[PDB]
Amino acid sequence: YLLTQPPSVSVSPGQTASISCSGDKLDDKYVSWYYQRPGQSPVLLMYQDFKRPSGIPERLSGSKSGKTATLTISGTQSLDEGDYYCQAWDASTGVSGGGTKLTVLFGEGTRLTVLAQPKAAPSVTLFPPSSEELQANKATLVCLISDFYPGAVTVAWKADSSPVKAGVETTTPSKQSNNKYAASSYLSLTPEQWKSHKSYSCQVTHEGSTVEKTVAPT
Amino acid sequence: EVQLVESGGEVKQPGQSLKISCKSSGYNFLDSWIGWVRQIPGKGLEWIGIIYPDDSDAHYSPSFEGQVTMSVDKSISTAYLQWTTLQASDTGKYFCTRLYLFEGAQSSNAFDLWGQGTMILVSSGTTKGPSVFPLAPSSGTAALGCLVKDYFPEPVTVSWNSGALTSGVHTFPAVLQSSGLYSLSSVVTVPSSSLGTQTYICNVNHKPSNTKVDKKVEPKS
Amino acid sequence: RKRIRVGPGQTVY
């Protein structure tokens, strides 16, 4: 069977966050949870629904109820940000014999945001293709998204008015020196597509609010 | 120091064979299960399988079975994962991990130990330096930067004015393009006053292709 | 030692 988790949960520092993990056999299956900071190896947080392995703080507690397990973090600090995964097992004998076959399953993970600063709307700067790139028969629009918080945005590219999903690439937001986030999005175009539109636009959405820049051929 | 040490990250062409290892110390190797887990960059955790070092009893997840082999060498506290033929979809960072049997009047198991991961990038892409293009002063406070287009493999390092200029610089992480090559940008924030008096050059190094570039960024006359 | 206990009342090995 599969484990369903909320893709993301947001909490103010000092308050309590719950991460849910629903699944059809979870009402006769122990659930464990793992923490993982971007870049590092996962680490065991909890096993057998609610038990903490040595060194995990009381402020963390696991529970289960019906077909839904839960991880609960009280007193959430900034360091708690990161990805949380639940896991359980399956054990069934095949219809034609040969013993119990085990399965290890993981939820898709929940990213936890802890809001340690006020919302900042992004600045958007969009660069047209450079003469140099154009003389090498290429074109790449660059859209840079700066000074935002929290670190989540979605980008939409228009060609004139209509959206373009073709040739788009977008980084996950990373911290700036000033501690607000930044991202970038790229659209690959032919010199022909570039020269032939009235314009292109990169529209960034941050917390329901949009900011967009428009550019045009020289 | 109970721990798991895995082998180095590697780049492979498709079609090639492959064998990564996972080395054990600090506890009794034969007695605990070893599992394998894959993680595609930016994605969740995927179970590959588990193996019992003492007897090589093995459990595999459906979507990996018959594609990958687990094995152990008992004499050297070492577990193995191996591909006879590699695919691009085999890309990811591979974790080995120890399933621990916790005891009580209700025993059970969880993965309490984790190797550091082995980065495995499968790709047809050839090794090469990037093309670099200026991103001329825009918008105070104005932004300028460099677009570092089409290198492989990661990473590249980017400086400014040979490293004299560090304030107001943000070099982004890289995007993998459909073509299988990477590109990123580094950007500098400055006052318009300096623009047209101060000088801005990005110095790019891509060691695998031993390529080095400097590009003067300037505004339009 | 091979014991894997998957949930209440479920043992393999």
The CA distance from B93 to A36, in Å, is 14
Q: How many residues does chain A have?
A: 218
Q: Are residues A170 and A101 in the same domain?
A: no
| DSSP-based three-state secondary structure for A150 | coil
Residue at which a domain ends, from A98, A116, A134: A116
The CA distance from A68 to B164, in Å, is 55
Helix ranges restricted to H, A89-156: 131-135
Nearest CA in chain C to B34: C2
Chain A residues lying within 8 Å of C12, measured CB to CB: 91, 100, 102
The one-letter code for the residue type at B70 is M
Q: How many CA atoms lie within 13 A of B185 on its CB side?
A: 29
The one-letter code for the residue type at B148 is V
Q: What is the DSSP letter of A130?
A: P
Resolution attained, angstroms: 2.5
The CA distance from B135 to B189, in Å, is 12
The CA distance from B175 to A171, in Å, is 6
Q: Are residues A138 and A83 in the same domain?
A: no
Sign of CA dihedral B61, A41, A180, B182: negative
CA distances from A82 to A36, A113, B81 (A): 6, 7, 28
The CA distance from B59 to A101, in Å, is 7
Residue at which a domain ends, from A99, A116, A133: A116
Q: Are residues A68 and A128 in the same domain?
A: no
Q: Are residues A141 and A108 in the same domain?
A: no
Contact (CB, 8 A) for B18 and B86:
yes
Give the Cβ contact number of residue B205 at 10 Å.
15
Q: Are residues A123 and A96 in the same domain?
A: no
Radius of gyration of chain B (CA): 24
Residue at which a domain ends, from A86, A101, A116: A116
Contact (CB, 8 A) for B14 and B87:
yes
Query: What is the greatest pairwise CA distance in chain B?
Result: 80
Residue A98, by phi and psi: left (phi above 0), alpha (psi -120 to 50) or beta?
Answer: left
Residue entry with tokens 């008096």: B197
Q: Are residues A149 and A96 in the same domain?
A: no
- The token pair that represents B168 in the structure block: 């107001």
- DSSP-derived pairing of the beta strands B118-122 and B10-12: parallel
- The token pair that represents A50 in the structure block: 């609610």
Q: Are residues A12 and A68 in the same domain?
A: yes
Q: Which residue(s) pair with A39 in the sheet?
A: none
Contact (CB<8Å) B106/C8: yes
Nearest CA in chain B to A179: B170
Contact (CB, 8 A) for B181 and B129:
no
Residue A101, by phi and psi: left (phi above 0), alpha (psi -120 to 50) or beta?
Answer: beta
Contact (CB, 8 A) for B103 and B11:
no
Q: How far is B78 from chain C (nearest CA, A)?
A: 18
Chain B residues lying within 8 Å of A124, measured CB to CB: none
B100 vs C: CB within 8 A: no
Chain B residues lying within 8 Å of A3, measured CB to CB: none
Q: Are residues A80 and A153 in the same domain?
A: no
Q: Are residues A6 and A110 in the same domain?
A: yes
B73 vs C: CB within 8 A: no
Number of domains in chain A: 2
Contact (CB<8Å) C5/B107: yes
Q: Are residues A53 and A155 in the same domain?
A: no
Q: Residue A194 is inside which H or E element, if any?
A: helix A191-196
Chain C residues lying within 8 Å of B57, measured CB to CB: 2
Mutation target to probe the A interface, by most A beta carbons within 10 A, among B141, B170, B189 is: B170
* Backbone torsions φ then ψ of A54, nearest 5 degrees: -55, 130
Q: How far is A7 from chain B (nearest CA, A)?
A: 10
Helix ranges restricted to H, chain B: none
Q: Residue A62 is inside which H or E element, if any?
A: strand A60-65
Mutation target to probe the A interface, by most A beta carbons within 10 A, among B45, B118, B176 is: B45
- The token pair that represents C7 in the structure block: 């949930």
Hey, which bits of chain B come out as E strands?
3-6, 10-12, 18-25, 33-39, 46-51, 58-60, 69-73, 78-83, 92-102, 108-114, 118-122, 131-138, 141-151, 157-160, 169-171, 175-176, 182-191, 200-206, 211-217
Contact (CB<8Å) A89/C8: no
Contact (CB, 8 A) for B21 and B10:
no
Contact (CB<8Å) A102/C4: yes
The one-letter code for the residue type at B168 is G
Which CATH superfamily, name and number, covers B125-221? Immunoglobulins (2.60.40.10)
Contact (CB, 8 A) for B184 and B150:
no
Nearest CA in chain A to B113: A43
Q: Are residues A211 and A189 in the same domain?
A: yes
Cβ neighbours of residue B174 under 8 Å, at least 6 residues apart?
A: A171, B154, B155, B156, B182, B183, B184
Give the Cβ contact number of residue B143 at 10 Å.
21
The CA distance from A201 to A153, in Å, is 16
Mutation target to probe the C interface, by most C beta carbons within 10 A, among B30, B72, B108 is: B108
Chain C residues lying within 8 Å of B99, measured CB to CB: 4
Cβ neighbours of residue A169 under 8 Å, at least 6 residues apart?
A: A185, A186, A188, B175, B176, B177
Give the Cβ contact number of residue A106 at 10 Å.
21
Cβ neighbours of residue A200 under 8 Å, at least 6 residues apart?
A: A126, A141, A157, A158, A159, A160, A187, A189, A194, A214, A215, A216
Chain C residues lying within 8 Å of A102, measured CB to CB: 4, 6, 12
Give the Cβ contact number of residue B196 at 10 Å.
11
CATH number of the domain to which A143 belongs:
2.60.40.10
Q: Are residues A129 and A36 in the same domain?
A: no
The CA distance from B194 to A153, in Å, is 31
| Strand arrangement, sheet containing B3-6 | B3-6, B18-25, B78-83, B69-73
Asked if the B1-124 domain carries CATH number 2.60.40.2230, the reply is no
Contact (CB<8Å) A43/B114: yes
Experimental technique used to determine this entry: X-ray
Q: Domain limits at A162?
A: 117-217
Give the Cβ contact number of residue A59 at 10 Å.
13
What percentage of chain A's residues is helix, strand, coil (to nearest 5)?
10, 50, 40
Burial of C12 (0-12, 13-18, 19+ CB in 10 A): middle
| B149: nearest Cα among A134, A49, A11, A159 | A134
Mutation target to probe the C interface, by most C beta carbons within 10 A, among A25, A28, A47 is: A28
